């Protein structure tokens, strides 16, 4: 046992030394001589109403026009943001929903939360009603995030310190991802749907291969829980938001933290994070009732989305980069552009 | 607009009407978060998430038991029912630390805790037996005496009353260490047979609402 611990410590020291030498320079001093974004002023082009409690999750559809919103009132609402219409009103079995997702095809939506079950709802079907299709059970802790890979594959993260891949038709766990010490709070699928990163309360981020099931990399740069994670549009990096009241941009091909976004007046934790189409603007949503537009390259607050009376819970972008959506505890979803 | 868009807008209006109806129906309920630990009767107070619904005086209460993130979920809840076991003294300090953590919880600064001390009968029996002494686990107990004018009992033992009041004083002065008056700790005693628990929770929720109203009016 003592020998095993000594070897573990030696390997950790070797990892730290190897990843310390590779850091020849820093992204901060590499991106100093560029054009700063300036002022990112965005206006609420649409404000969605109908949710009568805190909004916890929201996910855009593939067409950048249909979006699902899950709120503490216990209802999944599909919004047509172009005409602010309510395409569907999906009543959830459990009101303690903390995540929701939109199937890439658009035929299905996913919702999960404190019940440890990821419910799938069939949208496009005869009889003209959205109906429950499959209920994914097997996670031990609360569900933090869920994302579809296709019409039959969905990846979830739970509070039991694990992430899983599912076959919806069989409704069975195809792979279990292990190694996180704390609760896993966020997961982002890669653009190629081959890898995905996850951050947890252990103040670390881990990259997982969807097929093999092994942890290819593990990252540690936080001194508090990581609450949100988002993959870069390139797929070769990601960003994490923590209770530290700071964001951090990590890479995959260098295996160490690259950037940190923080402000002295910013002492509230980061609730949500997302990336624009270009990945130039890491948009974060905090507990101070506003969102910040952090230039991911320069780590500066180039903009603010201040129209929410309560904490910003969810923050996503359209697939075409034309609009952003923010849901807060004020029970209002807002499309900004 | 096109006829198709007009029909879509009509459908959206019907959906809005349904949402308003559901919210109107669901607005009246009062929520409660049940916290505690094992061997504490946490789930044995009233007769994913084991939500329970119960009514008193035409007021509906929704108690939620989960199984410390996710505490953010219960941020606008009426009260937190924090059950503790005061029969076994070794983990009494663990329960005190848990109460401290929950009481100083950033998300729960304005949430009044209805603190419950369970299985007081076992504590009284242990006091009578004398096998275990709280002084062995809390030396200050040896230097503690029950208040003269604040001991309303039904004819119980002074030793039992003194021990119970010592534990209650520890919990209460943890509560008031730094509260600022924005929330209060309501201590109570339960023996797993006392069915007058819903009444206590109702009275404490009424007191919490009253205190919030007075604070809004600055009367207190």
């Amino acid at each position, epitope marked *: 046992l003592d020998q095993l611990r000594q070897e573990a410590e030696q390997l950790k020291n070797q990892i730290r030394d190897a990843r310390k030498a590779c850091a020849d320079a820093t992204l901060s001093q590499i991106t100093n001589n560029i054009d700063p974004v300036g002022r990112i002023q965005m206006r609420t082009r649409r404000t969605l109403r109908g949710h009568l409690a805190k909004i916890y999750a929201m996910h855009w559809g593939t067409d950048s*026009r*249909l979006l699902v919103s899950a709120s503490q009132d216990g209802k999944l609402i599909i919004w*047509d943001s*172009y*005409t602010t*219409n309510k*395409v*569907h009103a999906i009543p959830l079995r459990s009101s303690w929903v903390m995540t929701c997702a939109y199937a890439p095809s*658009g035929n299905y939506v996913a919702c999960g939360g404190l019940d440890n079950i990821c419910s799938i709802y069939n949208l*496009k079907t*005869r*009889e*003209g*009603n959205v109906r429950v299709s499959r209920e994914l059970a097997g996670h031990t802790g609360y569900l933090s995030c869920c994302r579809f890979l296709d019409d039959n594959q969905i990846v979830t993260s739970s509070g039991d310190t694990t992430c899983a891949l599912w076959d919806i038709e069989t409704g069975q766990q195809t792979t279990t991802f292990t190694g996180h010490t704390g609760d896993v709070m966020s997961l982002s699928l890669a653009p190629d749907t081959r890898l995905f990163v996850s951050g947890a309360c252990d103040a670390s981020a881990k990259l997982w291969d969807v097929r093999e099931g092994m942890c290819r990399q593990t990252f540690t740069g936080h001194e508090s829980d990581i609450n949100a994670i988002c993959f870069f549009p390139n797929g070769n990096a990601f960003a994490t938001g923590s209770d530290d009241a700071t964001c951090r941009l990590f890479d995959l091909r260098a295996d160490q933290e690259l950037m940190t976004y923080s402000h002295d007046n910013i002492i509230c934790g980061i609730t949500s994070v997302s990336f624009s189409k270009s990945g130039r603007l890491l948009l974060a949503g905090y507990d101070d009732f506003n969102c910040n537009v952090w230039d991911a390259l320069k780590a500066d607050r180039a903009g603010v989305l201040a129209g929410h009376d309560n904490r910003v819970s969810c923050l996503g972008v359209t697939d075409d980069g034309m609009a952003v959506a923010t849901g807060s505890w004020d029970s209002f979803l807002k499309i900004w552009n | *607009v*096109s*006829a*198709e*868009d*007009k*029909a*879509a807008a*009509e*459908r959206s209006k*019907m959906i809005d009407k349904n949402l308003r109806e559901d919210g109107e129906k669901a607005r009246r309920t009062l929520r409660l978060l049940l916290l505690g630990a094992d061997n504490s009767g946490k789930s044995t107070i009233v007769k994913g998430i084991f939500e329970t619904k119960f009514q008193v005086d035409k007021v509906n209460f929704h108690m939620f038991d989960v199984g410390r993130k996710w505490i953010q979920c219960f941020n606008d809840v009426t009260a937190i029912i924090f059950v503790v076991d005061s029969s076994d003294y070794n983990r009494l300090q663990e329960a005190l630390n848990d109460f401290k953590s929950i009481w100083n919880n950033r998300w729960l600064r304005t949430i009044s805790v209805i603190l419950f001390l369970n299985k007081q009968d076992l504590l009284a029996e242990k006091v009578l037996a004398g096998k275990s002494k709280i002084e062995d686990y809390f030396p200050e107990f040896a230097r503690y005496t029950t208040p003269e004018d604040a001991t309303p009992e039904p004819g119980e033992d002074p030793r039992v009353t003194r021990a119970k009041y010592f534990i209650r004083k520890e919990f209460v002065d943890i509560s008031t260490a730094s509260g600022d008056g924005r929330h209060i700790c309501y201590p109570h005693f339960t023996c797993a047979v006392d069915t007058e628990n819903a009444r206590r929770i109702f009275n404490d929720c009424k007191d919490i609402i009253l205190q919030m109203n007075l604070r809004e009016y600055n009367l207190v």
Partner: single-chain antibody, 231 residues
Framework: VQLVESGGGLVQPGGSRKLSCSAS????????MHWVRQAPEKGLEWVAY????????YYADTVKGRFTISRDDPKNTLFLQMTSLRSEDTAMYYC??????????????WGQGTTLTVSSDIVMTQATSSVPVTPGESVSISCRSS???????????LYWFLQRPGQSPQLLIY???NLASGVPDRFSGSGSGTAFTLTISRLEAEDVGVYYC?????????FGAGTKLEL
């Protein structure tokens, strides 16, 4: 999904009758309903329409004032009350379901009709009344409208239906570009402003009947003359 229709029968001119459409197999309450008749040998003619929640109703000027359209959602039924019947009201009547929201397919399901015998508007026409075809060939059927069916929202409101002998019309392409459910991929549609075409590649048996093109931009809903394909 079934829409069974009752009524019909012999009627003396100047009388009244009630047509019914009982629906079973879908969320009737969330579906709008339409009535479409077909003369003994002529094409199709829109009659009436009732919206979800009974909040919007439309009729046809040809029968406006004498017809009434209602619906019993809890009973899952659609009703058409007739009054002051005329000699031009002898036809076969059909009930159609159509739900309206983004990405939806109105006029998805038609039904078997009932025979009744008694003893301005946007215009689109079908130039060809008969077009012989051979199995395995490709057939293009085009039908043009009076004005542009393209709207500010980007939708071209043209719908295609096939009526095989002794059968009810069935939808093939909706909004001039989107396929339906249960229809083989061989059918397709396309076009631009006022120029609308429907292509069938690898024509096969069971694809013989009358093709009708309809518009939905604004009421009344007008049908084409009907292009008949024969072996």
């Amino acid at each position: 999904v079934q829409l069974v229709e009752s009524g019909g029968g012999l009627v003396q001119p100047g009388g009244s009758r009630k047509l019914s459409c009982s629906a079973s197999g879908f969320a009737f309450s969330s579906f709008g309903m339409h009535w479409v008749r077909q003369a003994p040998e002529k094409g199709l003619e829109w009659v009436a329409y009732i919206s979800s929640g009974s909040g919007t109703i439309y009729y046809a000027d040809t029968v406006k004032g004498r017809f009434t359209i209602s619906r019993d959602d809890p009973k899952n039924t659609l009703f058409l009350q007739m009054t002051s019947l005329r000699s031009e009201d002898t036809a076969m009547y059909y009930c159609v379901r159509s739900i309206y929201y983004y990405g939806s397919s109105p006029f998805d399901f038609w039904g078997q009709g009932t025979t009744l015998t008694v003893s301005s508007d946007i215009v689109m026409t079908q130039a060809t009344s008969s077009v012989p075809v051979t199995p395995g060939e490709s057939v293009s059927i085009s039908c043009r409208s009076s004005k542009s069916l393209l709207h500010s929202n980007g939708n071209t409101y043209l719908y295609w239906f096939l009526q095989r002998p002794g059968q009810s019309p069935q939808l093939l392409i909706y909004r001039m570009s989107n396929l339906a459910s249960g229809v083989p991929d061989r059918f397709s549609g396309s076009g631009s402003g006022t120029a609308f075409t429907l292509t069938i590649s690898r024509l096969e048996a069971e694809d013989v009947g009358v093709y009708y093109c309809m518009q939905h931009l604004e009421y009344p809903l007008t049908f084409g003359a009907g292009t008949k394909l024969e072996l």
